[PDB]
Amino acid sequence: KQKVFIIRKSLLDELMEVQHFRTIYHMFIAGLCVFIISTLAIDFILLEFDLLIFSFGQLPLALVTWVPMFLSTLLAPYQALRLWARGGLGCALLAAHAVVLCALPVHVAVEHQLPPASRCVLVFEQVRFLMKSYSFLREAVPGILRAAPSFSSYLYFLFCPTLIYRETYPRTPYVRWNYVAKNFAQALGCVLYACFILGRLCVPVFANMSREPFSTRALVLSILHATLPGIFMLLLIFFAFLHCWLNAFAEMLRFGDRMFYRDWWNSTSFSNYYRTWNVVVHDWLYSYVYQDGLRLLGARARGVAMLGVFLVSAVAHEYIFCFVLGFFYPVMLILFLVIGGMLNFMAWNVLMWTMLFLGQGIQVSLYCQEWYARR
Amino acid sequence: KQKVFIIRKSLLDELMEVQHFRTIYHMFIAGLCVFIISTLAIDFILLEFDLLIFSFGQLPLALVTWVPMFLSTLLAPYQALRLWARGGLGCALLAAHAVVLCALPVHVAVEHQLPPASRCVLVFEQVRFLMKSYSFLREAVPGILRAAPSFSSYLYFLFCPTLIYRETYPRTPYVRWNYVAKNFAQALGCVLYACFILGRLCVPVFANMSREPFSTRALVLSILHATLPGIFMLLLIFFAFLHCWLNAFAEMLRFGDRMFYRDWWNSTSFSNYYRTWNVVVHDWLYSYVYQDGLRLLGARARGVAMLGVFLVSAVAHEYIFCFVLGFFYPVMLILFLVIGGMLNFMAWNVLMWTMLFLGQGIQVSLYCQEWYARR
Amino acid sequence: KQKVFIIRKSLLDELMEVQHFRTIYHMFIAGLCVFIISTLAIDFILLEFDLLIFSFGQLPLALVTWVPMFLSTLLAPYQALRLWARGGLGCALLAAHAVVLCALPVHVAVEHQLPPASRCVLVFEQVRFLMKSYSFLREAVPGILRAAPSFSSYLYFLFCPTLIYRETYPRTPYVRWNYVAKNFAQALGCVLYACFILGRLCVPVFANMSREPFSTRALVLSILHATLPGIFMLLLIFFAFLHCWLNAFAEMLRFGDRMFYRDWWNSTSFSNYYRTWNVVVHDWLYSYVYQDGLRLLGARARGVAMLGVFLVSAVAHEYIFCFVLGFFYPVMLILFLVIGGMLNFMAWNVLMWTMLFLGQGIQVSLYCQEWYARR
Amino acid sequence: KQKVFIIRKSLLDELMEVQHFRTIYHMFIAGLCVFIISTLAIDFILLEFDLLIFSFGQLPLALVTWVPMFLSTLLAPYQALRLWARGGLGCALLAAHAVVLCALPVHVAVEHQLPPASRCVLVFEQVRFLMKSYSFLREAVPGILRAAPSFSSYLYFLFCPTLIYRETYPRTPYVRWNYVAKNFAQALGCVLYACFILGRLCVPVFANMSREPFSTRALVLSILHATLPGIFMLLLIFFAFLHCWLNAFAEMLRFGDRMFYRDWWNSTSFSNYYRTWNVVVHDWLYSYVYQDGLRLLGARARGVAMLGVFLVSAVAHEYIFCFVLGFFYPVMLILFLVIGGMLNFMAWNVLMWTMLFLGQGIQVSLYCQEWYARR
Numbered sequence A, B, C, D: 001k002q003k004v005f006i007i008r009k010s011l012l013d014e015l016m017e018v019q020h021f022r023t024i025y026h027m028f029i030a031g032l033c034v035f036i037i038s039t040l041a042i043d044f045i046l047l048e049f050d051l052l053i054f055s056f057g058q059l060p061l062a063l064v065t066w067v068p069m070f071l072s073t074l075l076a077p078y079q080a081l082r083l084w085a086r087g088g089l090g091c092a093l094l095a096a097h098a099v100v101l102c103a104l105p106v107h108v109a110v111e112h113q114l115p116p117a118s119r120c121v122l123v124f125e126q127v128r129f130l131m132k133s134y135s136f137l138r139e140a141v142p143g144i145l146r147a148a149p150s151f152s153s154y155l156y157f158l159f160c161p162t163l164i165y166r167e168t169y170p171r172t173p174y175v176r177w178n179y180v181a182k183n184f185a186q187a188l189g190c191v192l193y194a195c196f197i198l199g200r201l202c203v204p205v206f207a208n209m210s211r212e213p214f215s216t217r218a219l220v221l222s223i224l225h226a227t228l229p230g231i232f233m234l235l236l237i238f239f240a241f242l243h244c245w246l247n248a249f250a251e252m253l254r255f256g257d258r259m260f261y262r263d264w265w266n267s268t269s270f271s272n273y274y275r276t277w278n279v280v281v282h283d284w285l286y287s288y289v290y291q292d293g294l295r296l297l298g299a300r301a302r303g304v305a306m307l308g309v310f311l312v313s314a315v316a317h318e319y320i321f322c323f324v325l326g327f328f329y330p331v332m333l334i335l336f337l338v339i340g341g342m343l344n345f346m347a348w349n350v351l352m353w354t355m356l357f358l359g360q361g362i363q364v365s366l367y368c369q370e371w372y373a374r375r
């Protein structure tokens, strides 16, 4: 099987036309309005803009380092393919663009001492460009195993909200500029929501870990106290970056099949959650690691490949965090792995939800402790 | 107009057959499961059963005081009507046995020093019996203005989840004992949820008001800190007592028109919220105070009657709280009245939601302050 | 008259298909190859990359200041028009976007001490956005004098290589990505050519003005010595930025009428030179200042309007330089004005060419003297 | 094959009817006008006539030595042919009067100490007369191998701008005295241009070689500094002497086939440059050395003959310079030979252009060094 693209609509958008979800959405903006009013009234007797101005420290440098990587991934893979499919150098040149968007985004991140948020930008624009600079290549190589795709398609592909290089991409009539304006306004409102959640419900609880005790009561009640910013951070990450950001960019570009996420909130088991959360990266990962795995290995055993894919995902995410916060502290992978082992060796939706809540609680707690015991 | 009863089903129940609301519902039970696991793990190194055992102090006395009340409202109204509609003493009987249900529930509440939760029972039961006893009378009197309803109907009426005496009451085929068992299980799970919210997120913040400062920063940040238990208390009150309790009792009795609440969460303006929140008491109140008001006054001016009804509601609710917590501190009525004045003299749904959030925040904050500065 | 757009080709491109111009072009790249070989061989016993790394000092800041101005000019004028043509605020809001891309690009240029080359960027992206944010407005207002243009057209307009808002823009079949790659390669080769010309034939002659004499022989022979970098700077500015840059951007966007310049090298008189050099800004300037001048003034006298337009151009260019090099030294305007006066009071192509050569010679000489006597 | 003459017109003249080349031509006269104005203004606070008056020292002697030469080549070849084709002394006469034009122009050049420019006259005139006297003879001898051309034709031939004796010479209707006046005016303007280039951009840089260092940096940067007078000297030599001088003399005489040069500026390879630069001497040289070589040798190997011809040309040119500047310093032949070897053992137009630029740069540099280290 290979994924085939339809003119289906982002699931939450086809829900939001129902009234009750317009209500829930309104309740959440009301939540923001209470936070802004209360914080404005307190800090009057200025705002928590400090986390923003601190976290985006050298954002200028972070973007002028985004340009070289973008130009590398735009030119190097295409020229590699076009010249390599002309009978060369191509077997090397592909190497350089392996080493330029692998070495540069670390050198400018460590040697210049960037903050967390202005660093994550580059982290994400070296595990994008490998995912595509490789997707594109492995898609358009088996066309040349016949004993050169249109460039305009490859340019369009680098910005298109999917990681699969299909060069068809079913498109929509026109650009609803009102809709994209709304989506960006929501995405920026979402960043401001996250700014408040951190600056109000994370920093105050976690600042005082210089405290001597390290009593297990104190730690476990810190975990329970921190589980809620955990879930709102997840819901915000999800909503903004998988509904607002990719729809906005799928409306500027007139893209179809905007199923970037299936309803993960209905995922009975855990694997279903992981398949239906961030479906774009899942589909890239699924396609390449689970239809080159079962092809090259040709293994009747598939469970090996399921866990194979998922540890590839876990290792990638652990690396992302190990880079952003500048630690080597791999909590998430140990959690995912150990309970992976637990459920796979030894109404059902609720157990998944509870374990996801504690997953979030543990990750946020230990990462705040590590960020405020390394400073 | 007079309200007429159909075999419609409780709006949230017709929503819960949709999958995404089964998910939200599951997320909330997962919330409970996290609280029980974390609290069990913390109190291990017993539970917060103390608030329950304290709050239900003389619950035996609270119920053996409920019995005289129930017998008074069962017998006195009917015997009065039956003898009064036989041409007497009825005019004296009702007036003399309107005091038992008015005097007794205060005498056993103040002179015996009951806790809050074991007192609110008798508060709700005295207002409940006043409401539906008077309803019954004023419904069945104009039948006698002709120059005696079946008793079994009146007995059934006292337990029926409506306050309007219609003596038709469209009924359902049979009793789904699985469904009522589920609804009571949810209602009791809801009480346990409220027990955790109080014992974990209200008592700790509000215990230390013996603190001298009374600094406006401290108070306003306590209000913001307390706005969230406020909203969960409201949602729990609503869900348990207007969907679980009255559906359970509307399934044991085989009642129709289970529209005890319209979608208040879609109420654009405030009046709409008040008309569509606790629709049962609204409809009683609406019918009697707004179709005896506009009849006896015969006033072309109706806005007077709108505010008339709403201050009747506010005064009743203020009285309920003034009784339960044993204060004379009327915060809610001042808030409702003042912003009533504000909006009625001087996407729109969001403003209502934000002001409801702060309404909850102020009420919970000041009532916790008053309960822990009167003790 | 109003300018109307045809599918004509950039004049130099329709010349370059002739062979002899491919030769001249090749001679000039050979010139670059000699410079790179000779400088590489000298500096071996590294390169003149110092002028580049110095001149682009805070280029990150220069671009993250480009983003706010771009967003201001994108949103403010359109919203102003759309709401103003709905019967307001619009009469103010237009003011803010007057003050944001007028105040910000000075504040970030002076208060942060930017170099020359990283400053000119912002200079040019505040006399672009006024030229358009005003062109667009004054085009689409007389449509509303009838007692709202498509936004997509306005977005496309901000990047389109013309300053006239026509919202038709005759377009070409497809994108010749080979051609745009070639044009950008030439534009970057051109920047490198200018880098060599400065770092080899300007800095060495002009560095030693700390020298006491100020003898008129020394100055006049410095002027003759510097007249040649003057002409190559002009030819490079012209070729790269009016043939390479705007063709590249007119090929990515599929734009017609690429007559950004007529053959100014054939301009018999001076006015003809100014009309046929940078025809895009000329046509904006021509249209607005010479078809609102002769409309509002309604003056039978037009010579006044000719000089009117040209002093508007001169003042704008003087301001550009007064900003970039951070001087108040207005040499160009005095030269243009005085010889303007000279020829307009008191084979012919050659005189124009000679006076252009000395114009370049004087400007480059005095600006190098001023930059190395203010440092 | 033997070259056959058509009524084609000098390629640059058929280009100059196009407007853009009238512009380039005008730019160059403007260059002269800037030089004359700037030098007049500098030497005011007389001109560089000193190089002219010095370089043309004994020009009277140089011309009264030209007369005996011209009379020898006019009479000796013809009388020899006429008497030799009468059956004698001719075999002795020519051999005895081939020494007058070989011995005299050296004796009057060395024994009288002439300057460079007044000497080059006699150099060119001795090689010119050798070339066309021998041409005439070897053309009109095989007519006598039959077991006497009209003299007027031979007189006309000595002044005709070709070196091939064809005695047909397709002629034009009339003498455009305006055109010849223009061409001589340009040729004299060209000499004045070369006078300025030497007196302004060669003498100053090269005067100070008495300087001790002989540092390789100093020499190599002198080569780069001197490459530009090199190219303008070449372009001037070419333009004046191959378009102005020979057209002027081809218009006074009413000559056809004025293709004295093909477009060498389009020569892809080097051999093409040498075949299409100074086509008149090339055609003489080609015809005699490459259609007596391949006749007498009868060699299947032709590459030998290609290099044969070219070293004949190189040796002749080396001799010309060895005579004019009075050195024995053969730089040009070593350069031509070595890179000949380089390319013939071990868009393409650009490499030729770059190597031509450095060829000019090296020749001018080393010849200025040798002229100012031998004085």
Ligand SMILES: CC(=O)OC[C@@]1(C)[C@@H]2C[C@H](OC(C)=O)[C@@]3(C)Oc4cc(-c5cccnc5)oc(=O)c4[C@H](O)[C@@H]3[C@@]2(C)CC[C@@H]1OC(C)=O
Pocket (backbone or CB within 6 Å): A230, A233, A234, A237, A274, A310, A311, A313, A314, A315, A317, A320, A321, A324, A325, A332, A336, A359, A360, A363, A364, A365, A367, A368
């Ligand atoms: C340290 C950091 O930067 O994370 C920020 C944060 C919000 C992330 C954002 C992250 O978003 C990204 C980059 O994907 C997300 C959502 O992504 C993963 C990935 C996996 C996973 C998936 C497949 C296989 N193996 C592991 O497990 C998870 O539960 C989650 C978590 O929920 C996280 C978190 C929400 C957990 C709470 C975190 O907050 C802090 C301060 O620590």
Ligand SMILES: CC(=O)OC[C@@]1(C)[C@@H]2C[C@H](OC(C)=O)[C@@]3(C)Oc4cc(-c5cccnc5)oc(=O)c4[C@H](O)[C@@H]3[C@@]2(C)CC[C@@H]1OC(C)=O
Pocket (backbone or CB within 6 Å): B230, B233, B234, B237, B274, B310, B311, B313, B314, B315, B317, B320, B321, B324, B325, B332, B336, B359, B360, B363, B364, B365, B367, B368
């Ligand atoms: C002191 C007490 O016993 O209240 C318990 C509590 C939960 C109540 C339950 C109550 O439930 C009842 C008895 O109806 C409810 C919901 O009912 C009203 C009534 C009116 C109202 C309506 C019409 C006219 N005038 C006023 O406005 C409100 O927002 C609310 C509030 O939300 C409250 C509260 C939720 C506010 C927060 C409170 O918590 C504490 C500790 O103070």
Ligand SMILES: CC(=O)OC[C@@]1(C)[C@@H]2C[C@H](OC(C)=O)[C@@]3(C)Oc4cc(-c5cccnc5)oc(=O)c4[C@H](O)[C@@H]3[C@@]2(C)CC[C@@H]1OC(C)=O
Pocket (backbone or CB within 6 Å): C230, C233, C234, C237, C274, C310, C311, C313, C314, C315, C317, C320, C321, C324, C325, C332, C336, C359, C360, C363, C364, C365, C367, C368
């Ligand atoms: C100081 C600076 O940044 O200029 C750089 C430089 C290259 C500019 C670039 C500039 O390019 C721009 C911004 O337009 C350009 C070409 O634009 C004008 C404009 C007018 C003019 C036009 C109409 C009315 N009034 C005056 O007069 C001119 O001759 C020229 C000149 O040639 C200049 C120059 C080439 C003169 C030599 C300069 O070099 C130095 C170091 O001083």
Ligand SMILES: CC(=O)OC[C@@]1(C)[C@@H]2C[C@H](OC(C)=O)[C@@]3(C)Oc4cc(-c5cccnc5)oc(=O)c4[C@H](O)[C@@H]3[C@@]2(C)CC[C@@H]1OC(C)=O
Pocket (backbone or CB within 6 Å): D230, D233, D234, D237, D274, D310, D311, D313, D314, D315, D317, D320, D321, D324, D325, D332, D336, D359, D360, D363, D364, D365, D367, D368
């Ligand atoms: C020393 C001298 O008198 O030369 C004057 C000068 C201008 C000559 C004029 C000369 O003009 C003549 C006599 O033909 C010319 C152009 O002719 C040749 C001949 C060959 C050649 C051709 C075939 C085979 N082998 C060698 O290669 C060349 O590039 C060139 C050069 O460019 C030169 C020069 C331009 C080089 C620069 C020189 O300036 C100085 C001061 O040294």
Ligand SMILES: CC(C)CCC[C@@H](C)[C@H]1CC[C@H]2[C@@H]3CC=C4C[C@@H](O)CC[C@]4(C)[C@H]3CC[C@]12C
Pocket (backbone or CB within 6 Å): A024, A025, A026, A028, A029, A030, A032, A186, A189, A190, A193, A235, A236, A238, A239, A240, A265, B020, B021, B023, B024
């Ligand atoms: C712009 C600011 C206010 C951010 C708003 C975030 C809100 C609108 C987004 C973010 C996460 C989203 C929620 C995440 C998933 C679910 C579970 C599903 O069973 C009901 C919808 C619901 C509850 C979504 C509703 C919309 C949502 C709440």
Ligand SMILES: CC(C)CCC[C@@H](C)[C@H]1CC[C@H]2[C@@H]3CC=C4C[C@@H](O)CC[C@]4(C)[C@H]3CC[C@]12C
Pocket (backbone or CB within 6 Å): A051, A052, A055, A117, A120, A121, A122, A124, A125, A128, A191, A194, A195, A198
């Ligand atoms: C709440 C405070 C810390 C603000 C946090 C700012 C960071 C975490 C947010 C704000 C804007 C977001 C970025 C904007 C869009 C992109 C481009 C995409 O290709 C990769 C993710 C990335 C780079 C986002 C990652 C998360 C992000 C960087």
Ligand SMILES: CC(C)CCC[C@@H](C)[C@H]1CC[C@H]2[C@@H]3CC=C4C[C@@H](O)CC[C@]4(C)[C@H]3CC[C@]12C
Pocket (backbone or CB within 6 Å): A020, A021, A023, A024, B024, B025, B026, B028, B029, B030, B032, B186, B189, B190, B193, B235, B236, B238, B239, B240, B265
């Ligand atoms: C039994 C325990 C877990 C209590 C469960 C409480 C949950 C299931 C009840 C109580 C209050 C209810 C919510 C109150 C009103 C709204 C707003 C509406 O736009 C979406 C549904 C939603 C969000 C309801 C869903 C169900 C709900 C959340």
Ligand SMILES: CC(C)CCC[C@@H](C)[C@H]1CC[C@H]2[C@@H]3CC=C4C[C@@H](O)CC[C@]4(C)[C@H]3CC[C@]12C
Pocket (backbone or CB within 6 Å): B051, B052, B055, B117, B120, B121, B122, B124, B125, B128, B191, B194, B195, B198
């Ligand atoms: C969270 C802690 C304080 C538990 C609170 C217990 C109280 C507030 C709850 C638990 C059971 C509830 C009662 C059960 C049912 C009835 C009968 C009805 O006719 C009036 C309301 C009344 C009397 C409810 C009022 C609220 C109630 C008394």
Ligand SMILES: CC(C)CCC[C@@H](C)[C@H]1CC[C@H]2[C@@H]3CC=C4C[C@@H](O)CC[C@]4(C)[C@H]3CC[C@]12C
Pocket (backbone or CB within 6 Å): C024, C025, C026, C028, C029, C030, C032, C186, C189, C190, C193, C235, C236, C238, C239, C240, C265, D020, D021, D023, D024
């Ligand atoms: C890429 C590097 C080498 C820059 C190249 C610059 C060259 C190719 C460009 C820049 C300026 C241009 C010249 C400016 C104007 C003229 C005058 C005209 O009558 C002939 C063409 C000519 C001479 C142009 C030819 C092409 C040109 C010389």
Ligand SMILES: CC(C)CCC[C@@H](C)[C@H]1CC[C@H]2[C@@H]3CC=C4C[C@@H](O)CC[C@]4(C)[C@H]3CC[C@]12C
Pocket (backbone or CB within 6 Å): C051, C052, C055, C117, C120, C121, C122, C124, C125, C128, C191, C194, C195, C198
């Ligand atoms: C020779 C050395 C000093 C390098 C000079 C770099 C400067 C002068 C060059 C290099 C790139 C050029 C810029 C690139 C493109 C633009 C965008 C356009 O909308 C305004 C002009 C502007 C901003 C150019 C101005 C001149 C420029 C800034």
Ligand SMILES: CC(C)CCC[C@@H](C)[C@H]1CC[C@H]2[C@@H]3CC=C4C[C@@H](O)CC[C@]4(C)[C@H]3CC[C@]12C
Pocket (backbone or CB within 6 Å): C020, C021, C023, C024, D024, D025, D026, D028, D029, D030, D032, D186, D189, D190, D193, D235, D236, D238, D239, D240, D265
């Ligand atoms: C009389 C004075 C000013 C001397 C004038 C010299 C000028 C007019 C002559 C001398 C050498 C000639 C140039 C040499 C060869 C080329 C290369 C060709 O691809 C374009 C024409 C061009 C550029 C010629 C144009 C005319 C030219 C520049």
Ligand SMILES: CC(C)CCC[C@@H](C)[C@H]1CC[C@H]2[C@@H]3CC=C4C[C@@H](O)CC[C@]4(C)[C@H]3CC[C@]12C
Pocket (backbone or CB within 6 Å): D051, D052, D055, D117, D120, D121, D122, D124, D125, D128, D191, D194, D195, D198
């Ligand atoms: C720039 C300064 C040095 C002036 C140079 C003067 C010399 C180099 C110039 C000026 C006039 C030219 C001469 C005029 C015409 C002829 C006759 C021809 O049959 C041989 C070449 C010859 C003899 C020319 C050679 C070069 C020449 C001698």
Ligand SMILES: CCCCCCCC/C=C\CCCCCCCC(=O)O
Pocket (backbone or CB within 6 Å): A124, A127, A128, A158, A159, A160, A161, A162, A163, A246, A249, A280, A281, A316, A317
């Ligand atoms: C495990 C790592 C997760 C990586 C997340 C990748 C995000 C989705 C990837 C590609 C589609 C995004 C295209 C639109 C964003 C353009 C923004 C930009 O280029 O700056």
Ligand SMILES: CCCCCCCC/C=C\CCCCCCCC(=O)O
Pocket (backbone or CB within 6 Å): B124, B127, B128, B158, B159, B160, B161, B162, B163, B246, B249, B280, B281, B316, B317
């Ligand atoms: C303003 C005060 C609000 C009063 C709330 C009244 C609740 C609804 C009234 C009557 C229907 C309830 C019938 C089912 C409960 C019977 C419980 C019992 O008798 O113990």
Ligand SMILES: CCCCCCCC/C=C\CCCCCCCC(=O)O
Pocket (backbone or CB within 6 Å): C124, C127, C128, C158, C159, C160, C161, C162, C163, C246, C249, C280, C281, C316, C317
């Ligand atoms: C007198 C000031 C001269 C201003 C020069 C203006 C240049 C021409 C103006 C607009 C067309 C340019 C459009 C293409 C450039 C896009 C570059 C960018 O947005 O960064």
Ligand SMILES: CCCCCCCC/C=C\CCCCCCCC(=O)O
Pocket (backbone or CB within 6 Å): D124, D127, D128, D158, D159, D160, D161, D162, D163, D246, D249, D280, D281, D316, D317
């Ligand atoms: C290699 C040496 C180059 C020799 C260059 C020869 C120049 C061309 C030869 C003959 C045609 C010239 C005829 C016109 C000039 C006559 C001048 C005169 O007699 O004074």
